[PDB]
Amino acid sequence: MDSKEVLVHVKNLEKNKSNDAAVLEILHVLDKEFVPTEKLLRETKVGVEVNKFKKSTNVEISKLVKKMISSWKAQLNLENLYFQ
């Protein structure tokens, strides 16, 4: 997944926030197809946007967000330690 599509999903998160199933569909695409890089996370702010859903009243959304954010942090650490 490249930066342009990432920014569409980010805007779609805001525009579908009240639709639990729709938010799950956006998060599932990011979980399966988005590869976190320092540049992508800095330029697109998906980390900030997805992390905002940790406080969601939907339990399935909040658990998926926590798993996604954990994975992106761990991958970002590995990139910073050994590749940058």
Swiss-Prot record:
Residues of the TFIIS N-terminal domain: 5-73
Localization terms from the record: Nucleus
Domain of life: Eukaryota
Primary role: Necessary for efficient RNA polymerase II transcription elongation past template-encoded arresting sites. The arresting sites in DNA have the property of trapping a certain fraction of elongating RNA polymerases that pass through, resulting in locked ternary complexes. Cleavage of the nascent transcript by S-II allows the resumption of elongation from the new 3'-terminus. Can promote the transfer of one strand of a double-stranded DNA molecule to a homologous single strand and thus may be involved in recombination.
Family per record: Belongs to the TFS-II family.
Miscellaneous note of the record: S-II binds to RNA-polymerase II in the absence of transcription. Present with 6260 molecules/cell in log phase SD medium.
Record-given protein name: Transcription elongation factor S-II
Gene behind this protein: DST1
Full-protein positions shown: 1 to 73 of 309
